[PDB]
């Protein structure tokens, strides 16, 4: 994930 972001998890799906 870009320097403006972090990996999160929503509903079991990882997303930046």
């Amino acid at each position, epitope marked *: *994930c*870009g320097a403006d*972001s972090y990996e999160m998890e929503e*509903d*079991g*799906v*990882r*997303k*930046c």
Partner: antibody
Framework: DVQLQESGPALVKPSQSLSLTCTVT?????????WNWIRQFPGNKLEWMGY???????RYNPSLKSRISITRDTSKNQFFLQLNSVTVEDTATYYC?????????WGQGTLVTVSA | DILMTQSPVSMSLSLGDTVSITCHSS??????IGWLQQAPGKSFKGLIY???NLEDGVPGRFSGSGSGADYSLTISSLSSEDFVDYYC?????????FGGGTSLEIKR
């Protein structure tokens, strides 16, 4: 290895219901990830239909909202697609897939024709 | 919905060639893109997620680049098994959407 397999009818009449099963082995559908239906049209265009999450939350493509339901059976480790009021426009190859970090696991795909 | 425009639609290349497949999104997707591989007539394999991360057991010749709305899958030094179909997928906004695909064919 995690394995997914679609099953269901090859033919559904217009205005009837399309119902598919995805049988999951090697990983529990209650442990993690979202459990998706995707279809590929004649011509190869892909559409995301929706998912049921490991925690039972559903999310659906708005284009299909009035007609779609995704459900599961945790005892059998299976999840299901129901698509109502189908038309010839619903003829496609249907896939189940896992979304977690990208889309690592996919069923083999199953052709469903909608025709009278 | 987010439109994913994938290029080129098809390419003819030789063994050992390097190719980039690109996807442009109609809105910023913040690297929430995957690349999928498909043998024609068969099903899919996840190659890359979050724009750049290789899935387990994908060779170092596959790379991903891009940010914002423009991303590329690059295959450096094409091998025989690589001449198949490829698709991008965005999961940055619902509903999730796909690129139209790229078919790679080998010269002979």
């Amino acid at each position: 290895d995690v394995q997914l397999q679609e099953s269901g009818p090859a033919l559904v009449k217009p205005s009837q219901s399309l119902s598919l099963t995805c049988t999951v082995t090697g990983y529990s559908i209650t442990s993690d990830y979202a459990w998706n239906w995707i279809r590929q049209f004649p011509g190869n265009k892909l559409e995301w239909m929706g998912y049921i999450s490991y925690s039972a939350n559903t999310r659906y493509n708005p284009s299909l909202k009035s007609r779609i339901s995704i459900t599961r059976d945790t005892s059998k480790n299976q999840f299901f697609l129901q698509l109502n009021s189908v038309t010839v426009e619903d003829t496609a190859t249907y896939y189940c897939a896992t979304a977690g970090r990208g889309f690592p696991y996919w069923g083999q795909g199953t052709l469903v024709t909608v025709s009278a | 919905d987010i439109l994913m425009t994938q290029s080129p639609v098809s390419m003819s290349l030789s063994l050992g060639d390097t190719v980039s497949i690109t996807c442009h999104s109609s809105q910023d997707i913040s690297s929430n893109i995957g690349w999928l591989q498909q043998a024609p007539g068969k099903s899919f394999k996840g190659l890359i997620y979050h724009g750049t991360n290789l899935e387990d057991g994908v060779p170092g010749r596959f790379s991903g680049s891009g940010s914002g709305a423009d991303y590329s899958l690059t295959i450096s030094s094409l091998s025989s098994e690589d001449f198949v179909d490829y698709y991008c997928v965005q999961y940055g906004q619902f509903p999730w959407t796909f690129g139209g695909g790229t078919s790679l064919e080998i010269k002979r």
